[PDB]
Swiss-Prot record, chains A, B:
PTM field: Sumoylation mediates kainate receptor-mediated endocytosis and regulates synaptic transmission. Sumoylation is enhanced by PIAS3 and desumoylated by SENP1.
Extracellular compartment residues: 115-253
Name the record gives this protein: Glutamate receptor ionotropic, kainate 2
Compartment list: Cell membrane; Postsynaptic cell membrane
Lineage of the species this protein comes from: Eukaryota, Metazoa, Chordata, Craniata, Vertebrata
Reported function: Ionotropic glutamate receptor that functions as a cation-permeable ligand-gated ion channel, gated by L-glutamate and the glutamatergic agonist kainic acid. L-glutamate acts as an excitatory neurotransmitter at many synapses in the central nervous system. Binding of the excitatory neurotransmitter L-glutamate induces a conformation change, leading to the opening of the cation channel, and thereby converts the chemical signal to an electrical impulse. The receptor then desensitizes rapidly and enters a transient inactive state, characterized by the presence of bound agonist.
Residues that coordinate or bind L-glutamate: 84, 86, 91, 137-138, 186
Species of the source: Rattus norvegicus
Anything else known: The postsynaptic actions of Glu are mediated by a variety of receptors that are named according to their selective agonists. This receptor binds domoate > kainate > quisqualate > glutamate. It does not bind AMPA without coexpression with GRIK5.
Amino acid sequence: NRSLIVTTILEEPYVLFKKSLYGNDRFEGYCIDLLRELSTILGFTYEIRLVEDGKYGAQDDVNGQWNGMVRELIDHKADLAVAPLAITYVREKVIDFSKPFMTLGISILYRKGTPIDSADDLAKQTKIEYGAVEDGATMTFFKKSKISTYDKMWAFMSSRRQSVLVKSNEEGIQRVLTSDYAFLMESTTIEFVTQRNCNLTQIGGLIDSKGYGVGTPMGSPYRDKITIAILQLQEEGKLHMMKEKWWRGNGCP
Amino acid sequence: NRSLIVTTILEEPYVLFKKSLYGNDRFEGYCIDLLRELSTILGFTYEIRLVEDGKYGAQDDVNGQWNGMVRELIDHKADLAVAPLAITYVREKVIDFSKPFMTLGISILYRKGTPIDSADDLAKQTKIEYGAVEDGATMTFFKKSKISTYDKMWAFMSSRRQSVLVKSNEEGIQRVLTSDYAFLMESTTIEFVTQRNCNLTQIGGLIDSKGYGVGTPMGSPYRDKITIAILQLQEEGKLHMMKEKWWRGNGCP
Ligand SMILES: O=S1(=O)NCN(C2CC2)c2ccc(F)cc21
Ligand SMILES: O=S1(=O)NCN(C2CC2)c2ccc(F)cc21
Ligand SMILES: N[C@@H](CCC(=O)O)C(=O)O
Ligand SMILES: N[C@@H](CCC(=O)O)C(=O)O
Ligand SMILES: [Cl-]
Ligand SMILES: [Cl-]
Ligand SMILES: [Cl-]
Ligand code: NA
Ligand code: NA
């Protein structure tokens, strides 16, 4: 039976290169553990392939082409995307997702001890720049929002796109550390970053409420199978333990 | 085009009889508002029908028959279940769910000011009885659990099933108020109850992590359409406002 092609992306602590290797043995992380569990529960073999363009996925406003892992699924170049891939309405129109394996919301990463306490605080000023990962779900949330605060924030990011939209979460984190910049990013990843770097904090609450799911091409029979496996891992307490395994850090004052 | 048959159940603040009426105009609540929004977004007409047996749904261990709203969907007697219907692995094997419109977890409802602080505290004693809604998702969670604490709790409830499993959340709440009883119930409904009755509180944290979704017969084309509509309502901020509309209460000290 055919080995499934699994697209994914480098993103700590979900997917990393092991430090030390060939094939699937090159990789470790939460999403690699989830994939292995799914493969033994459902009985498939698989080949992990990092997405060539290093992107999560968004639709181009000029020519309508998608990029990233979403494009890989639209083109049926991969069977599954096992990654921190956010479930969103624009994506469900073109690909399918399993039920979520982790909850998250957009929030703000910044330095500690400042007067900035919300997105509104950022929106009403320009001295502190702010942005998001290019061609990801956070960017697309702001681009499409009709909520006043977030529409104003998108107008700001779009006018400085070259400078404030970054290629990766790692680049956004480094920009917070090296410039007066607040980074719009997902709360799960904020939690990981802030337990390891005590200079950094979440600002405000969660701006939306969604989850990560395993992506498939639309209509794939694997979507329902993976859903059932994820729900069982959740109920058995195994998803919680997988999160505890990878969200570890010395902690901060 | 055919009007969709929608099964639901009486459960404050999701579905209630208006206090004052015919047809769909008899009903109000969060899930009635969600249904109306879905009907205008997707363009369908519908007829609300309360589930005849007053149950959410579980599978009988002797004859394998389901009951409740789940059975209505298995038999294709309803197009949709729009209700506080928990997504679970046993149910996804037999029906389909949209993506979730609300998150919840199992927790404990009890009186304030006591030494009971967790499920473990309940499991290690018998003077305080405890139970759950019969033939709902919480009951089925305990019945199937291999987690030591919850397996012990199921052994206790099953041996006193006649007395500690109740027909409705309302009956469980009243049992907390009139007897030395702790009620295993969903955190969303706990939040509503505890902002209105200052004698009551959540004990401990969330025991699992799941959500409510719109149920459909397996394979229905409405599942994906409803998912996309729910995701848009979430992103636009409308699901949050719908929750604020119905989770209102004078509050407590
Ligand atoms: O993106 S979803 O599938 N649908 C929206 N929700 C919000 C609870 C409405 C959530 C909440 C938690 C999730 F894990 C996933 C989702
Ligand atoms: O029942 S689900 O579709 N899958 C399990 N999860 C837990 C995050 C793993 C969640 C979390 C929040 C939801 F709203 C739904 C679900
Ligand atoms: N996880 C996001 C990428 C990171 C972000 O947008 O903050 C996605 O699925 O597109
Ligand atoms: N909402 C539950 C019923 C209440 C409960 O089990 O606590 C269900 O879908 O079965
Ligand atoms: Cl690769
Ligand atoms: Cl009725
Ligand atoms: Cl789904
Ligand atoms: Na889809
Ligand atoms: Na299903």
